[PDB]
Amino acid sequence: QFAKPEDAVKYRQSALTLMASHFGRMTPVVKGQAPYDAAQIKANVEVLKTLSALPWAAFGPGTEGGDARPEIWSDAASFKQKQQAFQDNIVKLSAAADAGDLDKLRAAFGDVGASCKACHDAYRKK
Amino acid sequence: QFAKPEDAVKYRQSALTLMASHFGRMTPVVKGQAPYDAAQIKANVEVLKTLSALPWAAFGPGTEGGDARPEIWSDAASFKQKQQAFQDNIVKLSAAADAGDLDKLRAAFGDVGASCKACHDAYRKK
Ligand code: HEC
Ligand code: HEC
């Protein structure tokens, strides 16, 4: 759906910004600094689940650019494992949120965050 | 969820970029320049439905900035009508996509596009 590589870069950066917000906005809740309302978190996590599927199709062949490392494309099976593992960690978070279980939510949130960082360490410049 | 107004601006601009892509990528399909696969469009429109609910909470009080006109906030009931009417037009598109009806999809796509433009004309600078 992208006319130029820059359009795929803009798309993925936008998608990743919206993850970051739907992930990160739960930080005060998992820390107990903000109240836990199970319905509101269940709804937020379902938005995050949708968003978390979106960036990867905007790293298609030839869409080098942005802060993406060039190994995303030379190592496509490894990049695919990292995004699939991340999305699997999101499924854990969805199960916790759907269950209304704040201890499970806390644990799953930490696992998701570690999976963001695992990908960054391999595949994000800087 | 936004520490500064700039963070709400970045969020809404990202959300609106991802709409634009999930809307606009269907243009060749509604024109017949690309093939119509009912399942693929049904799935795309459900992403667009999720995305189309997101921008509006990032125009909260005091988040002036970007290319947003200042009337978004002085006229909050009118802005709310425009986003709700837009989302209602998205429901029409979802019904068409869920039905696998390309003529209904065409018509609903045009109505959605007109609703994007109606809001821009009132509320987007330039
Ligand atoms: C690989 C499988 C990734 C996972 C999982 C996550 N991120 Fe990431 N992120 C990735 C890359 C390759 C890039 C660079 C994209 C580019 O072309 O520039 C990023 C970038 C971000 C950004 C910045 C987006 C921007 O506005 O430019 C943010 C805010 C970001 N990533 C956040 C983030 C979070 C919170 C994640 C887990 C919830 C996450 N990312 C996972 C690669 C991958
Ligand atoms: C009001 C109820 C709107 C509707 C419906 C749509 N858009 Fe819009 N759009 C709106 C505003 C106020 C702005 C400016 C936001 C800001 O703070 O700068 C926009 C902006 C866009 C953009 C640019 C995003 C960017 O990267 O900066 C795009 C691509 C865009 N809008 C597309 C778009 C489409 C395709 C719509 C219908 C499917 C649509 N918008 C509806 C206000 C509103």
Q: Is the CB of B45 under 6 A from ligand 2?
A: no
A85 to A80, A117, A118, B11, B79: CA distances (angstroms): 8, 12, 10, 26, 40
B7 contacts in A (CB within 8 Å)? 21
Distance between CA B32 and CA A59 in Å, rounded? 27
Query: Any idea of the CA torsion for A16, A22, A28, A30, to the nearest 10 degrees?
Result: -100
Give the number of other CB atoms < 10 A from CB of residue B80.
Answer: 13
Q: Do B75 and B20 touch, CB atoms closer than 8 A?
A: no
* Sequential DSSP letters for B4-71: SHHHHHHHHHHHHHHHHHHHHTTHHHHHTSS---HHHHHHHHHHHHHHHTSGGGGS-TT---TTB-TH
Tell me the residue type at A101. Answer: D
Rg of chain B on CA atoms, in Å: 15
Q: Do B36 and A42 touch, CB atoms closer than 8 A?
A: no
Closest approach of chain A CAs to the CA of B54, in angstroms? 9
CATH fold, domain A2-126, is Four Helix Bundle (Hemerythrin (Met), subunit A) (1.20.120)
Q: Quick check: B54 contacting A, CB < 8 Å?
A: yes
Method: X-ray
Distance between CA B15 and CA A26 in Å, rounded? 19
Give me the resolution in angstroms, 1 decimal: 1.1
Ligand 1 centroid distance, CA of A4 (Å): 20
Give the residue from A19, A22, A21, A31 showing the smallest Cα distance to A110. Answer: A31
**Which residue of A1, A11, A25 is in closest CB contact with B17?**
A11
Q: Quick check: B47 contacting A, CB < 8 Å?
A: yes
Distance between CA B70 and CA B50 in Å, rounded? 26
